Structures are given as structure tokens and as C-alpha cells.
Amino acid sequence: AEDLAKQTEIAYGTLDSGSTKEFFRRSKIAVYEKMWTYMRSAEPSVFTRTTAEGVARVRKSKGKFAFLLESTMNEYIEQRKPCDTMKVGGNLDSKGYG
Amino acid sequence: AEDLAKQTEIAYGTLDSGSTKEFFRRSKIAVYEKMWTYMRSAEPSVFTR
Amino acid sequence: ILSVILLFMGGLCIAASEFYKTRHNIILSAGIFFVSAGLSNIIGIIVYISANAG
Amino acid sequence: IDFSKPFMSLGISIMIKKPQKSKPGVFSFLDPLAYEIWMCIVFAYIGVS
Amino acid sequence: MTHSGLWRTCCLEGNFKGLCKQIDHFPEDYEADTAEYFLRAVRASSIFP
Amino acid sequence: VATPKGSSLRTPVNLAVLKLSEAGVLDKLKNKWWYDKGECGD
Amino acid sequence: VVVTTIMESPYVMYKKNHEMFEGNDKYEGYCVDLASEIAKHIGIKYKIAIVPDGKYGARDADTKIWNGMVGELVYGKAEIAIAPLTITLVREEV
Ligand SMILES: NS(=O)(=O)c1cc2c(cc1Cl)N[C@H]([C@H]1C[C@H]3C=C[C@@H]1C3)NS2(=O)=O
Ligand SMILES: CCCCCCCCCCCCCCCC(=O)O
Ligand SMILES: CCCCCCCCCCCCCCCC(=O)O
Ligand SMILES: N[C@@H](CCC(=O)O)C(=O)O
Ligand SMILES: N[C@@H](CCC(=O)O)C(=O)O
Numbered sequence: 001a002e003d004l005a006k007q008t009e010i011a012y013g014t015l016d017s018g019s020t021k022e023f024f025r026r027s028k029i030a031v032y033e034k035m036w037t038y039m040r041s042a043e044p045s046v047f048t049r050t051t052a053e054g055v056a057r058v059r060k061s062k063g064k065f066a067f068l069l070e071s072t073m074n075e076y077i078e079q080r081k082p083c084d085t086m087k088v089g090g091n092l093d094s095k096g097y098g
Numbered sequence: 099a100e101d102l103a104k105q106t107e108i109a110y111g112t113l114d115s116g117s118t119k120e121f122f123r124r125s126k127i128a129v130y131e132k133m134w135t136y137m138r139s140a141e142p143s144v145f146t147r
Numbered sequence: 148i149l150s151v152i153l154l155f156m157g158g159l160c161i162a163a164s165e166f167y168k169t170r171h172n173i174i175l176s177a178g179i180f181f182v183s184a185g186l187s188n189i190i191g192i193i194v195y196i197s198a199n200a201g
Numbered sequence: 202i203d204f205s206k207p208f209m210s211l212g213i214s215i216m217i218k219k220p221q222k223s224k225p226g227v228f229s230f231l232d233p234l235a236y237e238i239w240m241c242i243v244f245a246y247i248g249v250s
Numbered sequence: 251m252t253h254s255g256l257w258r259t260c261c262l263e264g265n266f267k268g269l270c271k272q273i274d275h276f277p278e279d280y281e282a283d284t285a286e287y288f289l290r291a292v293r294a295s296s297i298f299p
Numbered sequence: 300v301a302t303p304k305g306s307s308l309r310t311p312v313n314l315a316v317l318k319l320s321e322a323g324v325l326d327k328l329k330n331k332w333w334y335d336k337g338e339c340g341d
Numbered sequence: 342v343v344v345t346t347i348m349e350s351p352y353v354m355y356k357k358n359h360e361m362f363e364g365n366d367k368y369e370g371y372c373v374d375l376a377s378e379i380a381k382h383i384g385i386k387y388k389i390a391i392v393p394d395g396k397y398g399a400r401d402a403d404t405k406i407w408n409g410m411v412g413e414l415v416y417g418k419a420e421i422a423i424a425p426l427t428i429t430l431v432r433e434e435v
Contacts, residue, residue, distance in 0.1 A: 017399035
């Protein structure tokens with residue numbers, strides 16, 4: 001996450017109405033807060049309607065966009081065709097499904 | 099300074115009645131505070147005259 | 148499979164070398180087959196190992 | 202008793218007495234190349250000759 | 251300081267200066283690798299010297 | 300963190316633990332009482 | 342029971358021929374086999390019903406209207422929401 005602060009050309013975003021988006025909004029951390037403000041004011045719309053749209057957009061991006069999502073969804077895409085996405089960095093928070 | 103927290107065999111201290119000693123005492127940092135408590139309770143005397 | 152064929156072909160030349168004793172190039176032809184068969188066996192081993200690394 | 206939500210994540214694991222580092226084998230000079238390459242070099246040596 | 255020998259090690263400058271002890275060529279500290287067990291057998295027996 | 304059956308200290312304790320997880324409290328606690336205590340790092 | 346779930350992957354996918362089955366049989370994934378196990382034990386006849394608005398769930402600070410799965414349960418439009426629904430504080434009070 002810190003490496004994102006080191007640059008501004010590469011964009012990133014989070015899914016709408018999803019836990020991840022709510023985490024940045026209420027994150028009282030020095031690095032996570034910064035990210036919440038970068039994306040809210042960034043044009044065009046980085047908050048994709050669904051995960052399917054976001055992943056495809058990153059594929060066509062060729063590297064100018066990074067998609068922020070949960071690890072579980074980040075393991076049935078790196079091992080599925082055309083196999084053109086990779087997870088960089090550990091996890092930011094420990095959560096679970098219910 | 100962080101690497102000091104990674105170990106305990108190697109000791110360290112600060113001069114007595116000198117700015118450096120006063121810095122750790124009133125340091126409200128996560129790492130510097132830890133050091134102030136390590137040395138104050140460490141025998142023998144690390145605070146040289 | 149090619150190595151098996153060449154070894155079989157070389158055997159015939161050796162077998163035929165007891166009827167046409169006057170001819171001498173038959174024995175040479177057998178030598179080429181057995182040497183060529185060995186070179187084909189090298190390729191087969193290399194391909195088999197290389198494929199299993201996929 | 203009424204448990205609460207997991208505050209941390211664990212999992213059964215095997216602990217063993219850390220086996221001291223081993224000494225490179227007597228024939229460690231063959232390690233840089235796989236056993237297949239050494240076998241094929243012999244075949245190439247015979248074939249070329 | 252000890253002037254170790256082929257069979258028995260002794261003492262040098264120190265409290266003891268002549269005390270010798272037969273070296274334990276099979277010391278227990280673990281595991282005995284089969285290649286390490288045969289090196290210490292040849293060593294201990296000093297067959298080659 | 301358990302609690303006896305019926306104890307009125309079930310609902311405040313659960314939510315409480317969830318508060319600490321979304322604040323970076325738990326993660327720092329783990330990093331300090333585990334990783335930092337490494338006395339054997341060529 | 343009206344199970345609420347969302348179209349993700351590999352949580353709720355579809356088969357190579359999804360035109361001819363009828364009902365829950367047509368859904369496959371990780372939150373449909375788990376639902377089978379959860380319902381085989383408790384002994385219930387669940388009915389899968391894909392969340393209409395097609396969102397995971399959130400609360401609009403403007404109108405406080407809970408949308409998505411989390412808002413598909415507070416009003417009474419379903420009971421058991423077997424899906425990927427992370428645990429957060431905003432949702433633990435509803
Ligand atoms: N990484 S860890 O083990 O330190 C760790 C593990 C876990 C934490 C918090 C930490 Cl710091 N909280 C989660 C909790 C937060 C909400 C999501 C799952 C439960 C409720 N449980 S966990 O996934 O077991
Ligand atoms: C596809 C690769 C084939 C390799 C094996 C082919 C071996 C051919 C052997 C021919 C030998 C001929 C010797 C006699 C020649 C002559 O009559 O002068
Ligand atoms: C034909 C006579 C040959 C004589 C020399 C051969 C010596 C072979 C090795 C002897 C010592 C081996 C010691 C153990 C080595 C090991 O396993 O690590
Ligand atoms: N399923 C998560 C969101 C997933 C995501 O944002 O990628 C939730 O509870 O909202
Ligand atoms: N020069 C310092 C003392 C030396 C030190 O703090 O290390 C002072 O002003 O007190």
C-alpha cells in the first residue's frame with residue numbers, strides 16, 4: 001500500500017458498496033486515509049459497479065490500474081484464463097465471511 | 099534504534115544529566131519510550147558519570 | 148520408434164552379411180544404422196525428459 | 202459458555218528439534234547440473250567419439 | 251589452548267598443563283548421517299596414517 | 300473471549316473486539332509480541 | 342427459506358448448459374455447496390433468490406436506507422443470506 005503513495009500516474013480503486021470501500025473511509029491510519037482522499041476526487045469513476053468490470057478494466061489497462069479487492073477473489077483469477085493478473089503484497093487487514 | 103529492540107544481550111545507556119537522557123524520558127514515541135524503561139531498570143549502572 | 152527401426156534394419160544387414168560375403172558395403176551400412184540408432188535414442192531421451200518438465 | 206468472535210487466527214502445527222545444517226555431500230561438485238544432464242553428457246561423449 | 255593430537259588431546263597454559271584425555275571421536279550432541287558416520291569411523295581408527 | 304450462558308457481558312464484548320480489528324489495534328499487537336522478539340535473524 | 346446471494350465467482354457460477362435446469366440445480370459454486378451442507382444438517386428446504394439490486398450491501402448516509410443483501414434482510418425479504426458477506430461494525434448492529 002505504501003508504494004502506491006510513492007506514485008500518482010497509476011490509478012486504483014475499490015468496489016462500490018463493499019467492505020473494502022468502507023475500510024478506507026473510516027481508516028484512521030496515516031497511509032490508508034491518504035488513499036481514501038486520492039480516489040474519491042479522482043476522475044473518471046474508479047469505483048466499479050461490479051468486480052467483473054473492474055478486473056476486465058485492469059486487463060485492458062496494461063498496468064496503469066491496480067484493483068484493490070479481497071484475497072479470496074484474488075486467487076481464482078490468477079489461476080484462471082487468460083492468467084494475466086498477479087497479487088503483489090500481503091494482506092492489509094484480517095477479515096472473514098459469514 | 100529499532101534494531102536495539104530486536105535484541106537484549108547488547109546493552110546501551112546515556113550520559114547522566116545530559117539532553118539525551120532527558121529525551122528518552124519524555125519521548126512519547128513507541129520505540130523511544132521502550133528504551134527508556136529498558137535502561138532505567140537494567141543493572142549495573144549504564145548511565146555513566 | 149525410429150531407433151527400433153534402425154536397429155532392426157542394421158540386423159538385416161548383419162544377417163545378409165553371411166550370404167553375400169563378397170559384398171563389403173553391407174557391413175558398413177549396418178555400422179551406420181547402429182550408430183544412427185544410438186543418435187536417435189539420445190534425442191528420444193532428451194525429448195522425454197524435456198516434455199516431463201512442462 | 203458463549204464464545205465471541207475470533208480475535209486472532211491459529212492452526213495446529215508440528216514442532217521438531219531444529220536439525221542442524223548439513224554438510225554438502227562428498228559429491229557436491231555434481232550439484233550444479235541435474236542428474237539428467239550428467240547422464241546425457243555421457244551419452245554425448247560416447248556418441249561423438 | 252590445547253595441543254590436540256591424533257589420538258589424545260592434552261592441556262597447555264592453564265590450571266592443568268599435562269593432563270591428557272582420550273579424544274571422543276563419536277561425541278553425542280542430534281543425528282548421525284550415514285556419510286558422517288563413516289568419516290568419523292575412518293578418523294577414529296586412523297587406518298590411513 | 301467466552302462468557303457464561305446468559306451473562307449480560309456477551310453483546311458488549313463481541314462488538315468491542317470488532318472495534319479493535321478495524322482500528323489497526325490487533326495487527327500491531329501481533330507484530331509486537333511475535334515478530335519483534337526475534338533473537339536469531341552470510 | 343429464501344437464500345440471498347450475489348453473482349460472483351467461484352462462489353456462485355453456472356454450468357456449461359444453464360438453459361434447461363430448473364431452480365437451485367442450476368447454480369454451482371462455493372456458496373451453493375455450503376448452502377446444501379448448511380441445509381442438510383438443520384433440515385430446511387432453501388430457495389436461492391439472487392439479490393435484485395445486485396450489490397453486496399451498504400447504508401446511504403443520506404437516507405439511511407440499507408441496500409444490498411444486508412438491506413435485503415433487515416426489512417424481511419429473506420432470512421438466511423448464504424453468500425460472501427464480510428463482518429463489519431456497520432452491519433453488526435442490523
Ligand atoms: N492476522 S491475525 O491472526 O493477527 C488476526 C486474525 C483475525 C483478526 C485479527 C487479527 Cl489481527 N480478526 C478477525 C475478526 C474480524 C471480523 C472478521 C473476522 C473476525 C470478525 N478474525 S481473524 O481473521 O481470526
Ligand atoms: C531420418 C534419419 C535416418 C538415419 C539413418 C539412415 C542411415 C542410412 C545408412 C546408409 C548407408 C549407406 C552405405 C553404402 C553407401 C554406398 O553404396 O556407397
Ligand atoms: C584403489 C585404492 C584407493 C584408495 C583411496 C580411496 C579412499 C576413499 C575414501 C576414504 C575416506 C572416506 C571418508 C568418508 C567420506 C565421506 O563419506 O564423507
Ligand atoms: N463481500 C464484501 C466486499 C467484497 C469486495 O469489496 O471486493 C462485503 O462484505 O461487502
Ligand atoms: N550536551 C548535552 C549533554 C550530552 C548528551 O546529552 O549526550 C546537554 O546539553 O546536556
